Structure 1
Amino acid sequence: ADKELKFLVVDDFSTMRRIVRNLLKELGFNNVEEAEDGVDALNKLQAGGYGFVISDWNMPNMDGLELLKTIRADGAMSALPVLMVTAEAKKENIIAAAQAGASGYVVKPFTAATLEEKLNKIFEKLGM
């Protein structure tokens, strides 16, 4: 819950990243970085230092699921909490996401309340 926790917000849509960034700020998290897609996210994650990933599901080059699978398979990123944030909510994804090891799942549009809830349960289930 260290409000210093570095978040990587991944979404191919600028406005959405802005919204998420601001919802995090409202919650007290100001250490937020943005990525445009899975590849751009990985390029940035290699630089280490990130403690939480909020990733959109649909993005070009490399979508959310693939990013999650890639993170979970990488020794160094393996334990990175990953919260899927998608507009949809198909049962298949939820299943795939969970199977791949998604730390949580949220349907946009969402409120700081909903986010806070999800972030809390994840910080809890883990240790932060």
Structure 2
Amino acid sequence: ARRILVVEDEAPIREMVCFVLEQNGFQPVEAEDYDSAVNQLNEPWPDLILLDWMLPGGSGIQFIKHLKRESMTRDIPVVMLTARGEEEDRVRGLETGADDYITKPFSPKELVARIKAVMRRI
């Protein structure tokens, strides 16, 4: 119920995210790229995925769209991680299937708020 898959290749950033999550009672799981993220999709299944738009190895769009093909993954909420500004406004306009978005450098308060709100919904 608190298994959060964190898909971010930059170590310090990925660690900042995991620290905020762990300190807040969540159980973070790390992935550094498209394929390693895909390798985490099995029981126990992530309850939420934080997806870096710029993850190496593939398209964040296809990653999300491919989740909708199976029972155990189609209702997992995905929050797209985006760089503040241009990328953000831009990615928001794409057909990604993301349930919500969070901008980097991230705000610990926004990270927890959006995860709380997204899970309440989805």
Question: TM-score if structure 1 supplies the norm length?
Answer: 0.82
Identity of aligned residues (%): 28
Q: What residue in structure 2 maps to residue 36 of structure 1?
A: 32
Consecutive unaligned residues of structure 1, counting only runs of 5 or more, are none
Q: What residue in structure 1 maps to residue 8 of structure 2?
A: 11
The residue identity in structure 2 corresponding to 1:32 is P
Higher helix proportion (structure 1 or 2)? 1
Higher strand proportion (structure 1 or 2)? 2
Q: What residue in structure 1 maps to residue 89 of structure 2?
A: 91
The number of residues matched between the two structures is: 120
Q: Deviations over 1:42-69 (max 9, x none)?
A: 1121344221111111022123222112
Consecutive unaligned residues of structure 2, counting only runs of 5 or more, are none
Runs (4+) off by over 4 Å: none
Partner residue of 1:107 out of 103, 108, 116: 103
Secondary structure in 2 matching 1:100 = coil
Question: TM-score if structure 2 supplies the norm length?
Answer: 0.85
